[PDB]
Each structure stands twice: as structure tokens, then as C-alpha cells.
Design a protein around this ligand. Structure first.
Ligand SMILES: NC(=O)c1ccc[n+]([C@@H]2O[C@H](COP(=O)([O-])OP(=O)(O)OC[C@H]3O[C@@H](n4cnc5c(N)ncnc54)[C@H](O)[C@@H]3O)[C@@H](O)[C@H]2O)c1
Ligand SMILES: NC(=O)c1ccc[n+]([C@@H]2O[C@H](COP(=O)([O-])OP(=O)(O)OC[C@H]3O[C@@H](n4cnc5c(N)ncnc54)[C@H](O)[C@@H]3O)[C@@H](O)[C@H]2O)c1
Ligand SMILES: NC(=O)c1ccc[n+]([C@@H]2O[C@H](COP(=O)([O-])OP(=O)(O)OC[C@H]3O[C@@H](n4cnc5c(N)ncnc54)[C@H](O)[C@@H]3O)[C@@H](O)[C@H]2O)c1
Ligand SMILES: NC(=O)c1ccc[n+]([C@@H]2O[C@H](COP(=O)([O-])OP(=O)(O)OC[C@H]3O[C@@H](n4cnc5c(N)ncnc54)[C@H](O)[C@@H]3O)[C@@H](O)[C@H]2O)c1
Ligand SMILES: Nc1ncnc2[nH]cnc12
Ligand SMILES: Nc1ncnc2[nH]cnc12
Ligand SMILES: [K+]
Ligand SMILES: [K+]
Ligand SMILES: [K+]
Ligand SMILES: [K+]
Lengths: 461, 462, 462, 461
């Protein structure tokens, strides 16, 4: 008799449980945290609010938190990212979950509220795990009193980390935060290699288009852009890369990509004459990876080659001007999360019109929207950092401090490199890799300890 | 002609060197852009720079850029096998004191650094230092400590040199401030990685002409140099295995598609032949050390390596391979300069048709510079543009002329500001013909940066 | 109005299938160019084609091209798992007899084929055959030989089906001539290789969502399918080892940067469990069979596989893997359709948390079509353009109307002319926006070819 | 006092011998044949005229032929391809060889004539080994009486095969020939993987240019063009491919390359107007791989981006219109086989001029001209076929047969597939590869013998 949840179909739990059991065999660092911390229950008494894509991998993270003594209430941070069998398996385990694939904006905010409100009253939560900063924002603005009982926040992705650093700069951050994103076992694993695996995966599932030999334009060459570009180049695409950062643009050149701008001389003045129409007219696929706003604007969408694929893999859908296409062009749904955007007009469309674009996931996270996001063995590194971060702040008990000590402890920090290396060692062991041990003469030679850390904090890997 | 203050292999190679210098200038836009931006201002007027770095064509473009900005220099190479003799000849013929040639002995190498330090038998009036590896910095602190009183800074090129500087700084033995040129993103993530990608397989082909496709390679280390070294072999079709002590770098090697193995059973190096994974090493056609550590290809590993395997090092010092063991116990047969067959059948002579031998490249020294020409000009353009900026900043700071209290507040090891790193990168990108997009004012505010940059926090790892 | 001569999973999927068919048409320029060139001529007017090939969206475009050229068809799939139900629905709603759905039983599979052969309980007046694998060909020669008396030819799609055709030709049991569509270059060196490159990792990701980078794969076979399959995994960052019985194909795997190994010690398959290289197979995370041969992943290999390894087959028939052994001894746990966990702990039941299992995809059937959608439209464009040209050629030849003495002079297995192979390629290249250069008259005379081609001798291997 | 040779420096023999001993360890197929047929001496009485790149790898081929009973007289088939230390070691072994690196055209012909003539009179040769057809050409048209005693020709390369087939089609071929090129262990190994190894190798030694991130244009996508394209693409070059064969162009597209033409709409009308000046104005490196004439013409050379590198890896230098450049532009030698072509005029040049092109090896085969050509382990496959071909033709004894039996055997043939497979097996074993043996049931299942041949002659691999 348990009802504190809402999912798409609860009869999918058995299917979800089967994939969770498989996923656990793929997540040795996360499962390793279960064995190491089960006896001590480091999260005994923790009441975590979690907002992150309700996938099979999140389910293993959720149950790792529960198995260490934490009670949780969960929702997804994107309307399309939920795997309905995962949410059913979590709901069947008696865990409050409110998520399903294909939510509306109303139901998205409603699901976040159900994590905040237990029986119409704010839940006595003391921890926050967020992915993107949506939950962090609603708490800071609509329920400020609840932050006086919270010991910290653990933010997953780059976008949310920036929103936190804006509050630490404006002094509006109430509880300290752990930058989970900037762990190397997260940033240079999740963001890069994760998109390398799931970008072409999502494009194949959505369109079944051959990618080899076609022209692609990747907007951005950060960690997501590096992996996305590799995701396409290893399929045989001719990949071009756009950047505003000259350093990231230099890496693209050395990595074998031609660096181009959508605008003549790189100057985006908002006009049609600025668009490199010749370049945009040969592009078969464009992927936005910036986390910025309107990096695939209307004039770019108007100049795109007919029947080009448009998708976003940054956190928010405002990287593409989907609002422009909703206002001016008619959408023909091919299937869930696949739409043909007929550039002929808004008042209907010809079914055999050749001048259309193909938008995936309505501009949302395409890897989670049109597929299943990152594989379990990669999310293993991300969520092992998340579990360690939840402990690293719960054991510090920020909320129990006087105001004078709170000011000196308030910050946004990454985990120490020692934790980062420990997660990495468990991931390497999952591949059967054998790490070499330094001899005492060698550790002295390079001035490190045999047990690490092996790099100064300034090292970039 | 009147100028005899140098020593190179063959001065008649100068015209050849000049032709390749003119070519390299077209390949180094960031460095030539600095040469044109600061030519009129002469920011290095009065600078007298002691330079110790591989006397290649690329170094020559760095030298003449420093001189073009007003500096005087005295130069030597930081490795016995790395000098390009036509590069050294063009520099000497340009009226520039240079003491470097390919194939120096260990005594001549020390002698060449001494010749830059001393002019006419007395200490030169140097006020700046450019170093690659820290050998020159070490000789100054030990044998000529009085010279450091007039020196305003050191600009260190490579990772091993920066480590030696940081140890001296912690021990309070560093007498002058330094700039970590290596840790610029347009250096570490350009020179150290992409440079070795270009030049590792290049050196092995020139030395052995061995087909690399389909053969088994073991790369010791997966730092910046190990990353590019593994890519250099993997892009040629080698089956590449990676060894590492850092699990994070090991994690990257797995995700990059490499099998991570250790030369020792369970990774434990206890010094016994029994600890050696003889099965693994008996399958290896080529081993490359990239660590900057000591004895990472030890004696027992050399005994266990497959017959006719190739052994080389692309780290800064030759002690990564126990070449001393091989000199002591095995016979060396010179195939050609910097290529030695090492016969494991004994020390006295060898059968000319002996099958049990190893091929050692560059006698364990930097193989890319020893058996080829090191990094290409367009890559070195980023490194040496950071060097010029680093020389200008430390020379204009004038540490030796500061008060004591100000000396203590600036006695440190620093990196260049990210803005200068981005400006070097921008000229590199333009050299490829790339076009960088300019942020709109609203986009710049959306991500919290200036339209001009910098675009990343100092914590960003790229 | 009242069309019931079909059997599909769900007719309401027709609108969805039509939308994807319209998309696929824009991805298949060679096939749509054939439909535009030959529509007015109706070269297949009077052709009655028995079709047996994976009822995919791509096959739908092929079907409607044959019908647009004037043919009548009756269709089934050549595999129990390869049908796309939305494609079968769209074809059925168009008034075209089709009998195919995803997840047929063996009996339902045979029934579907017979529904194309029979119309209203009697043999259809068929005169052409399009086949993929040779099942429909085999049923006609064995069960309906009188129908072949009126059939002009067979256009066979795949390597396995072509081998079965040549077995009949040497034995004198082939009743009608055939065109080997497989050995067009725009089919063999496009469909078989690049198609598997695209769809092999696609199917594994959809079935398991397993990370592939850094894990060990074993590909059995290095033909066209094995070449593309190895690349499908190596481009994802797998450490890929290759097995082969052909030394030439093994040489290519070596040169392509793969380690060539055998599942058996010294490659000797004696049938005993002792011949298995248990150490090798205990390291393998994924095994893929690509051979078209029998039992290339046998019971002993399956017993020695690493725990939780994935087992799949991309050859035409499931007997490449000894799945019968696994049915007899081990318990099958369905994760989801076409994905099974096979627990090696026993037959009667299993622990839900058992760790000693294998993951079998598509029950050993064609994994790219079983767990994904097979090859993409733009690749199948080349294969199915050859099919249309082959059908047009054999139908126009009218073999069945010859006298018995003239039939025997024409009974053969042939390939399409190279000029047609080249013309299919040109349209494929134009689909990518590529621009083929035209020879000058002097250049064409220099290499001894016509300006319009063919540009290669028939012996050229590309 | 053996003086029947002409090399650059006989003192380089010991160096050449040290490298010959190494190459033997890299060539198991060729060295296996040397050991297999040593006892029979199947080439006893064979007097072989040999014309092929006097490299270290050719040294092992020569010494294998003499070890089977053959006398030889040798020359190189290119003025820049000889390794001087290989020629010295061969001459020091008492083998007549006339070759050095950097011959003039007049010295080239003199070297071939020195093999043809012994003591002023034609040698009593009976076998011909040729690479490119120059020696076959000189024999047919200047020494036709010598062909009356020659049993056959074994031709190495694609260009030479074409010349043999033209002579056969026109009735001018006087002796039978074996097409060594079209063995799979030759064409699909030497022509493809050999250029993959040696193309970027020669460009690095000649210019030391960074290749990653620059634009390359490869003319042709045959066996040499495929291997050349990968040689550059694996270095990080943005490679564009040109082709007249749409089947090869299709392969380039699927292999991930953009297929373009130097001429607008691929139409070469001879005028500057037909040149895609915008495309050629962005190319940093152009490589010709066709075996055709004038595929990099004067109009293309005028339009190339400043400081672009021009090189040819086809057999003959006429793939590039170097004659136009000698007539109109000033040549500045950087170093042997590396020239800057100053497009500012014929009479003189400014040493600091920026409008030049870099020509490698004066248009001759760049991999052999600026480096050492294919590696030993690759040439192992080609030269094993050559030895088998010399044995087969010498034993046929065409020069002894009657007229009607000559007309039956006057042909150009390839080696049997069974031998092609046996060569590949030794090559595979050289890598430590293990080939699986078919079971009797499996061999019956696919209709082959356990010993092979495993493919029909129609198979393309
Ligand atoms: N879908 C996923 O699985 C996934 C995973 C991690 C992060 N993300 C999201 O992806 C986004 C990027 O994350 P990241 O870690 O790569 O960040 P990042 O800062 O490392 O990279 C973003 C890059 O975009 C560039 N950029 C910004 N505006 C641009 C413009 N107008 N044109 C061109 N380039 C521009 C920046 O210079 C920067 O290099 C964030 O929103 C993050 O939340 C998605
Ligand atoms: N030859 C060149 O062109 C060139 C260029 C740049 C740097 N270098 C030299 O290369 C060396 C490495 O430089 P880097 O920037 O890559 O440094 P790095 O610290 O980034 O890489 C060295 C790596 O070696 C690993 N390592 C150390 N001891 C090991 C052991 N016993 N077994 C396995 N792995 C071990 C460390 O974990 C580290 O990741 C330095 O000596 C540097 O001076 C050479
Ligand atoms: N799934 C698809 O999309 C698809 C597409 C085309 C073909 N196929 C099928 O795949 C199979 C292979 O097709 P192909 O064109 O690559 O044929 P192929 O003849 O070119 O390749 C088969 C290879 O397997 C090798 N082999 C045979 N027995 C072996 C053994 N015991 N161990 C190791 N290697 C062995 C052979 O030497 C040969 O090289 C056929 O059944 C064909 O019908 C599937
Ligand atoms: N340097 C070496 O090591 C080496 C090795 C083998 C062969 N070769 C020589 O290289 C040449 C090519 O040999 P191959 O085996 O690749 O021959 P090939 O017949 O397989 O390939 C040549 C290709 O060039 C294409 N082509 C012809 N004219 C063209 C034009 N105008 N524009 C674009 N493409 C055009 C043809 O379509 C063909 O595909 C021959 O001269 C051969 O003797 C050199
Ligand atoms: N998509 C597809 N349609 C038909 N037959 C196929 N064979 C492989 N892929 C196929
Ligand atoms: N190394 C080499 N020796 C002889 N002929 C060759 N052709 C290409 N490379 C060669
Ligand atoms: K997933
Ligand atoms: K260089
Ligand atoms: K498909
Ligand atoms: K060579």
C-alpha cells in the first residue's frame, strides 16, 4: 500500500528492475561505494531532494543513496529524459518518484513540487542533488526557509554550476555547493566520452540516417563539443566546428577539424547578410553544445540545407530558436521526439514538400530525448562523485553552524583529487586495466606519494 | 667574418639553414605576429638572455625574434642529439653566439652551456634566462650563483624543468622568479601532446623504416606526451597498450580505446625477474617511455622484451630507460648514427647475423629530436610565442632591481594570464584559416564573460 | 476498398510508415532516379515478382519502385525479426500483398512465404523472383517446381543466397537463371561493409546500452561484413581482435591495425574443450560472427566466454552460433524483446541476481536488423538500385519463353555490367553532393578508357 | 677485382649490409621462399635483367634470386628512388648494379643500358624483372633480338601492367608476362598500405610541415589514392578526394571524405575559367595518385593557395605539369628533392617572396624520392610474388617453344590464388597472427578445401 509517486506505467517496474540489475554490473565504482559505506551508514538521517534525468543510471544512484541511509524524493530535470521503466522500478521499491517521458512544462514543474511537498507541507530535507539548477532555483526563490535545514547542494552539470557561481558572486547562495561537474572522472568522462557514445546513438534512433560522408556543423568545442564532434567524425562525417574560444578552436584544428563561423568574419549582427549562406547550404546536420543562448538562430535555420537535421545536446533548448520555428513554420510529427519543420509556411504543409528541417527532441537534450543518454559505465564515474559529494557535505553539517562559521564555510568547491583518483581507479578496474605502482625511488623522483595524489591541482589532463 | 664567438659543426650549412628559417617563419604566425607587434617598441632592449633549448630551426625563429625585439643572446642546446646543424650555422652566421651541434659528448654538452655563461673567460652580464629542462638553471644556481643577482627571471619550457623549479622554490633555493611556459594551454595541450603525435612515428620511421601497422606497442605513461605518443602509434595501425601510475590518466587511456596493462604482475615492481609479466613483454614490438620519471623501462623489462623489439624514450632525460645496464652487459652495434642494435648474447662482440637483439633509438635520449627534427614549426609557434611573452613580462618586471620586500612578493613560479594564452591561440587558429565566432553582447552576458575574453575560468581544463 | 490480401502486425501503423517512406525516398537518389527514368516505359509491365527480403522501410521503397515500373508483387520477409511493422503496414495499406511482422515464429515465417507463392489457395502466376538468402528460392525448387517453368529469373541479394545458387548450378538443379546482385561493387563494397559499420554498433547500443569504448571485442570473420563490423566497433573505441580462416583476409586485418587471433590454440578446432584458448575468451566482452559459415562460435567457446559478455551474429543465418546448445543446457531470461540473458548455472530456473550469464541479441539472428533497423536508406539505395536493374534485365530476357535447347545455353548466374555499377555509384556520389571529375579526351586515351567509362577492367578489385 | 657496377659510394656497403640483415628479419614470406627453394635451385640458368627501385627491400629480392641460381644485372626504375647504401652492399656482393640517388635522365638510360650490354655486346639474358615498363620498352624497341631468348617478364606496378596490356592488344608484345601487381598480397598491400606508411613519411622529411588541421586534395582514389588519403587523414588533415571513377568516388564518400573536382562541375575545358579557384585557393597540399597525365595541370598550379605543397606518388612525374613550371617559374632548391617554385616570374626570385609552391622530388614518386618508399614488411608481400613469378615463367621456357605453342602462352597472367594465400599466411605469421583452421564440416559447408583456396577468383577482398 504505497502511493507517494506518479509514473507513466507502474507495470514496467519488472522490466526496469531487470535493466537495473544489468546496470549495476556496469557501475563498479558506484556499487563499490555501496560495499565500502554500507556498514557505517554515512547518510543515515539524510533527506535528499534529487532532480536529475530519471534513467536506469539514476536509479542505481538513487538506490546507492538509499542503501547508505538516505531518504529521497526524486524528479527528472528534463521533460523527455525519463526512462519509464526506470521510474516504475524506483516507484515499486517504495521511493517517491515523479517523472515520465514526454512531460509538459506544467507537469515538469509539478513533479519538482511533489519532491518539495510531502502531504502539502515542505519535506524536512537537508540535502540537495540537482542537475541544471532548476531545483536549486525553485528552493532559493519560492521556499527560502527550507534552505536553513539543508547542509549543501551537489550540482551535476556545467549549466547548474554556472548558476551557482552567480549566486556565490551575488551573495545569494544560502548553502554551500559541490561542483560535481569539474571532477575529471565527471567532466572529462561524462561530458566528453558520454556524448561521444550517445549523440550518434540518438541521431540513428531518431532518423536512421547514414552519417558517413555527410556534412556536420558542431557549435562549440568544450567537453560536450569535443565528444559530440568525435561522435560524428568516427561515423565518417565531415565535421566542421564553431567556437568563440580561441583555445578550444585551436584544439579543434589540431584534432583535425576545420573551424568555421556561421557568420561572415565571425560577426553575428542579427542580419541575413551576415550568414555564410554557402556554408549553411551544405550542412546536413547541426548540433549545439554550448550551453549558451541562441547559437543556432533563425537566420541560420533559414539558410540550412533542405532536409538537414537540427538537434541540441546542451542542457537547455534555447540554444536553438525553436520559438521562431513554432511561430512561423508548420511542424509534422514523424514520431515521438522527431518533427519535420516545413519552412513553406504555418498554415498547413504539403506531405511531399522537400523544403523541411528535421528537429530532434523538440530541441531538448537529444541524447536523452531520442535515446537513453550516457551508458551505465560512464555514469558510474559521475554518480560515484555524486555519492561522495553527498557524504562530503552531510558529514560537515553546514546548517548546524552558527552564522559566523557559515560565512567562512560557504563556497562552491570540487572534490579533492584523492577522491577523483579513487573513482578513476575503480573505473579502470572495470575495464580490467592494471595500474602500475610507483617504487619509493620513483615517487621520490617526481615528488609524489605512492598512494597519490599523482598530479598537482593545476594539472589539466 | 671577424666574428668567431661560436662553435657549430659546419658553418657552411648556414645558407641551407636560412632557407628553412624563411620557410618556418611562414609556418609560425603567432611568433611572427609578436615580432611585428613589438618590433618598434623594442621591449627587450637591454635584455641579455642565456638560452638553453634544442638548437632546431624552430628555436632559430625564437632566437631571431628575441633579437628582433632588442635582446642579446648566448645560446646552446639542451640535448646532445637535438641540434639541427643547419639551424645552428644560420644562427652563428647571423652574428649570434651559439654553441651546439648534433652528436655532442657529455663533456662538450657541459662545455657548450659554459660558453654561453662565460664571454672571454669571465661571466657574461646576463639578466634573463630561457631554459628547457633546467640544466642551465641548475648550473647557474650551483656554479655561478653570483650571476643570478643580475638576472630578472627564468622562462622554463618543459615539464621536467618546471618540476625542478618548484622543488627549488619550496626549498627556498630559487634565487630568481620564473614563468611556467609549459603550463600554457597553447603549450602543454599543443606542444607536449600534438607535437609528439607528429614526431614520434616520424622519428621511428627515419631510424628503422619499420612498418608500424599491425605490430604491438607499449606506451609507458599517459600524460600529455603519452597521449600524443599513443595517438602517434595508434593512427599508424599499431595495437597500443598503455601503462600508468595515475588512475585518472589510466581512465582516459581506457576511454580512448587502449588496453591498460602493467609491465609487472599486478603492477607491483619489487625488483625481481619474477615480477615481470614476461608473457606481455614477450609480445611487444615497440616500447616508448613518456613519463619524465626514472627507470620506467628497467633491466628486467629489457631482458623480457620480444626479440628485435624497438626501444626509445620521448621524455626529457635518458634515465627513463636503464641504458646503463645495456652498456654494461650487452654489445652495441651501430646500424647508423643514433641507431644501435643491442645484442643480448654478451658483451664481447656479436654475431653479425645474431637474431637476439634490441634496436635502441637516440641512445635513449629524446627520440623525436634525436632521430628526426622534433615538433613542427606550426606547433612550436604556440610554445615559443608564450616564451617571448614570458621573456617580455619578466624582463619588464626587473626583479633584480626591485627592493627586498618587493623581491619577496614576486619570488614565485607563475603562468601567463589566460588572455595572452587565448591571443596566442587566436593567431594559431588564423594560421589554419579557422574563423572564430564573436559573442553577441547578450550571449556574453548569458555565460558571464566579456566579448573580448577570457572565456573560461582559471579552473577550466580544456 | 476491401483489400484483405495481406497479413501484418498492425495496419494502423501505415501513416507512420508512409511518413518514413517519404523521408527514405529523399535518402535514396539512385533508386528514385530509376523510378523517374523508367516510369513512362513501364519495363516491368507484366512482371509478377515473388519477393522475400527484410520488410524494412528501405525494402518498401524498393517494392514501390518495382510497382511504379509496372510490376505486381507478393512479399514476405527473409527473417523473423527484421520486419519494421510500420513499413509492412504502409505497404499493405497501399494495396500490395505483404505477409511480414517483427517476431514471427518459424511456422509463421514459412506460412508468410507460402502466402506469396499461393493466391486464393492456388499457385500465383509468378514469373520473377527477388530473394535474400535463398529460402524462397529453395522452397520453389523443392515444393513448387512447376512454378519455375514460368519464372524468368532470380535476383539474389546476399552472399549466402549466392552460394546456394552456385551449389544448384554445379549440381544441375538450378531451374532458372539468376543475377548475383551481391557482387556489384555498389552492393558488396557498400551494403556488406559500410552498412554493417553503421548498423552493428547501433543494434548493440539499442539492445544493451553498453559502453563499448575500452572493452574487448572478438570479430569472427574478416570478409566484407567482418571488415565493416570490426570498424563499427573499433571506431567506438573497442580493442578489437579478429579471427579468420582466409590468410589474405587475415593479412588485411593485420594491416588495418587489428590483432589476428584464433579461438582455438594454434587454430586447431578438435572439438574438445581443451583446444579452446580459455585465457583469450575469458577476456572478451563482445563476440560477433560475420562468416556465413556454421558453428563459428561453438558451445565450448560459449562456455569459456567472460561473464556477462554479449553474443550476437550479423551473418545471414543464426547457425553461426550454437544457440541450440544454450537452449538445451542454460536458462533464458528475457530482458526485453530480442535481448536474452542466458544463465550458465543450469537449465531449470535461475537466480535473478546470478552473475554468470551471457547476453544474446536477437536469439542469434541478424543482429543489425533484429535489434535495430539494419542498414540506412542511403546505403540500401545502392543495393536496391541494382535489384531493380537486375529484375528489369532478367524479365526483359524472357528466359521461360525459350525452347528447351536455348534455355540451357542461357542457364547461368551472372552479375550486372560494370557500366551499370558505375552509373549507380554516380547517383550515390551526387547524393552526398560529391563532384566526379570528367576525363579529357587525351587523358581517356592515355589510360585506354572511354570518357564515359567503364573506367576499370573487370578484374579490378577496388 | 670486381668493377662491373656503378654506385655512388662503395664505402656505404657495410651500412647497407647491416640494414639488409634487419630487412631480412622483416620479410618472412620472401625469406621463407629463399629457404624453401634453395635446394632445388629453380632459377639456375636464369639471367635476369632487373629494373626496379634499388632500395634495401630490393636488395633482399636480388639476393633471393641469386640464392636460387640466377644471375642478374640491375638498375633502378627511378632517378631518385635508389638507397645508395643498398646499391653499395649489392655491388660489394659481386652483383652488377648501376644505380644511385639523384641520377640525371641521361644517367638513367645509361644505367639500364649497362644491364642490357655486357662488354659492349648484348648480354645473353633470358628473364626480365621490371617496375614501370621502361626496361621492357627499351628491349622491345632497341634490342628486339634479345627478346628471342627471353622467357618472360614479371612486371611490378599498375603503370607497367597497362603498358603490357597495350602491347598485347596491339600485337607488339614479344614475350609472355606475369602481372605481379594484381596479386592481392601486392595490389591491396603494397599499393594501399605502402603509401599509407610512406606518403606522410616523405612529406615530413621533405618539409617537416605540421599536417594536422590543414587542407589536402588527393587526386585519385584507387589503391594508391586510398592509402594516400588515409596517410594524410590519420595525421589530422582535412582531406578532399577527386576521382573520375564514380565507384571509387563512392568509396571515398563512405570512407568519410568530401569528393570534389578541381574544375567547376568536373568539366576541364582547358581555360582558367573552369578552375574552382575558391576550392584550390584553400588547399595546403595536393597529391596525385592516378597514373594518368596532367591531373594537376598548369591552371591548377596557378590557382593553388600560396605555399601549398605539391607532390606525386604515381609512377611517372607527368601527373603534374612540371614542364610548365620549368618554363614560367623560378626554381629555388631548399635541399635535395625539395624546391620552392616562385610564381613571380622566370628570371630570378626574391629570397623572401611569399608566392611560391613547394615541389617534392621534382614530381617523381615522392615516397621513394623524399623517403625510403614502402617498409620491408610490406614489400615482403610484393617481392615474394616476384620470386614466384620469375620461377614460373623461367620454367615455362617460352623462348624454346614452337610457334603454335607460343601463341597459346603469349599472354599476361596473374599468379594462382593458392600462392596468393600462401604468401599472406607467412605475412600474417610475421605479425604473430594465428589463422583458424576450418573443420571438415565447415569446409564442406562453404564448399572449400581445408587448405584453400578459400575464395573464388571473382572475390574482391
Ligand atoms: N547532454 C549531455 O549528456 C550533457 C552532458 C554534460 C553537459 N551538458 C550540457 O552541455 C553544455 C556544455 O557543457 P560543457 O561541459 O561542454 O561546457 P564547456 O564550457 O566546457 O563548453 C561550451 C563551449 O561552448 C562555447 N561557446 C559558447 N557560446 C558559443 C557560441 N555562440 N558559438 C560557439 N561556441 C560557443 C564556449 O566557448 C565553450 O568552449 C551545458 O549546458 C551542459 O549542461 C550536456
Ligand atoms: N620530446 C618532446 O618533444 C617532449 C615534449 C614535451 C615534454 N617532454 C618531456 O616528456 C616528459 C613528460 O611530459 P608531460 O608533459 O607529458 O608530463 P605528464 O606529467 O603530464 O606525463 C607523465 C606521466 O607519466 C606517468 N608516470 C610516471 N611514472 C610512471 C611509471 N613508473 N609508470 C607509468 N606511468 C608513469 C605520470 O602519472 C604522468 O601522467 C617530461 O620529461 C617532459 O619534459 C618531451
Ligand atoms: N546483416 C547484414 O546486413 C548482412 C549484409 C550482407 C551480408 N550478410 C551476411 O553475412 C555473411 C558474410 O557476408 P560477407 O559478404 O562478409 O561474406 P565474405 O565471404 O566476404 O566473408 C565471410 C568471411 O568469413 C570467413 N570465415 C569462414 N569461416 C570462418 C571461420 N570458421 N572462422 C573465421 N572466419 C571464417 C571467410 O574466410 C570469409 O572471409 C553472409 O552470410 C551474408 O549473407 C549480412
Ligand atoms: N609510389 C608508390 O609506392 C607506388 C606504388 C604502387 C603504384 N604506384 C603507381 O601509382 C599509380 C596508381 O596506382 P594504383 O594501383 O592506385 O592504380 P589504380 O588504377 O587502382 O588507381 C588510379 C585511380 O586514379 C583515378 N583517376 C584517373 N585519372 C584521374 C583524374 N584525372 N582525376 C582523378 N582521378 C583520376 C582512376 O579512376 C583510378 O581509380 C600508378 O602509376 C602506379 O604504378 C606507385
Ligand atoms: N534496411 C535493410 N532493408 C533491407 N535489407 C537489408 N539488409 C540489411 N539492411 C537492410
Ligand atoms: N621500398 C621499396 N622498394 C622497392 N620498390 C618499392 N616501391 C615502393 N616502395 C618500394
Ligand atoms: K543509458
Ligand atoms: K621540426
Ligand atoms: K534502416
Ligand atoms: K623502406
Amino acid at each position: 500500500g504505497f502511493t507517494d509517486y506518479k509514473v507513466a506505467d507502474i507495470t514496467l517496474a519488472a522490466w526496469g528492475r531487470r535493466e537495473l540489475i544489468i546496470a549495476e554490473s556496469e557501475m563498479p565504482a558506484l556499487m563499490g561505494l555501496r560495499r565500502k559505506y554500507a556498514g557505517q551508514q554515512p547518510l543515515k538521517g539524510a533527506k535528499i531532494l534529487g532532480c536529475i534525468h530519471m534513467t536506469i543510471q539514476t536509479g542505481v544512484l538513487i538506490e546507492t543513496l538509499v542503501a547508505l541511509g538516505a531518504e529521497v524524493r526524486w524528479s527528472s530535470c528534463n521533460i523527455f529524459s525519463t526512462q519509464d521503466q526506470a521510474a516504475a522500478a524506483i516507484a515499486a521499491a517504495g521511493i517517491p518518484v515523479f517523472a515520465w517521458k514526454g512531460e509538459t512544462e506544467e507537469e515538469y514543474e509539478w513533479c519538482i513540487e511533489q519532491t518539495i511537498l510531502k502531504d502539502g507541507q515542505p519535506w524536512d530535507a537537508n540535502m540537495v542533488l540537482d542537475d541544471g539548477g532548476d531545483l536549486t532555483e525553485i528552493l532559493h526563490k519560492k521556499y527560502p526557509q527550507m534552505l536553513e535545514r539543508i547542509h549543501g547542494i551537489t550540482e551535476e552539470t556545467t549549466t547548474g554550476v554556472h548558476r551557482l557561481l552567480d549566486m556565490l558572486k551575488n551573495g545569494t547562495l544560502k548553502v554551500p555547493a559541490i561542483n560535481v561537474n569539474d571532477s575529471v572522472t565527471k567532466s572529462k568522462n561524462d561530458n566528453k566520452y558520454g556524448c561521444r557514445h550517445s549523440l550518434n546513438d540518438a541521431i540513428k534512433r531518431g532518423t536512421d540516417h547514414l552519417l558517413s560522408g555527410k556534412q556536420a556543423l558542431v557549435i562549440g568545442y568544450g567537453d560536450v563539443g569535443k565528444g559530440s564532434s568525435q561522435s560524428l567524425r568516427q561515423e565518417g562525417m565531415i565535421v566542421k566546428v564553431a567556437e568563440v574560444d580561441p583555445i578550444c578552436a585551436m584544439q579543434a584544428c589540431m584534432d583535425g577539424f576545420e573551424v568555421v563561423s556561421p557568420y561572415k568574419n565571425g560577426i553575428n549582427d542579427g542580419t541575413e547578410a551576415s550568414i555564410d549562406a554557402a556554408l549553411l547550404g551544405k550542412i546536413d546536420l547541426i548540433v549545439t553544445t554550448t550551453g549558451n543562448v541562441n547559437v543556432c538562430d533563425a537566420n541560420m535555420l533559414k539558410a540550412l540545407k533542405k532536409r538537414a537535421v537540427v538537434c541540441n545536446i546542451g542542457h537547455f533548448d534555447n540554444e536553438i530558436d525553436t520559438a521562431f520555428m513554432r511561430k512561423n513554420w508548420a511542424w509534422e510529427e514523424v514520431k515521438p521526439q522527431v518533427h519535420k519543420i516545413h519552412r513553406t509556411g504555418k498554415d498547413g504543409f504539403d506531405a511531399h514538400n522537400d523544403d523541411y528541417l528535421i528537429l530532434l527532441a523538440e530541441g531538448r537534450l537529444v541524447n536523452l530525448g531520442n535515446a537513453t543518454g550516457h551508458p551505465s559505465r560512464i555514469m558510474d564515474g559521475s554518480f560515484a562523485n555524486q555519492v561522495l559529494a553527498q557524504i562530503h557535505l552531510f558529514e560537515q553539517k553546514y546548517a548546524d553552524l552558527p552564522a559566523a562559521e557559515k560565512a567562512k564555510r560557504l563556497s562552491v568547491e570540487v572534490l579533492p583529487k584523492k577522491l577523483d583518483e579513487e573513482v578513476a581507479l575503480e573505473m579502470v578496474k572495470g575495464f580490467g586495466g592494471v595500474v602500475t605502482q610507483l617504487t619509493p625511488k620513483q615517487a621520490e623522483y617526481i615528488g609524489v606519494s605512492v598512494e597519490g595524489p599523482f598530479k598537482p591541482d593545476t594539472y589539466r589532463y
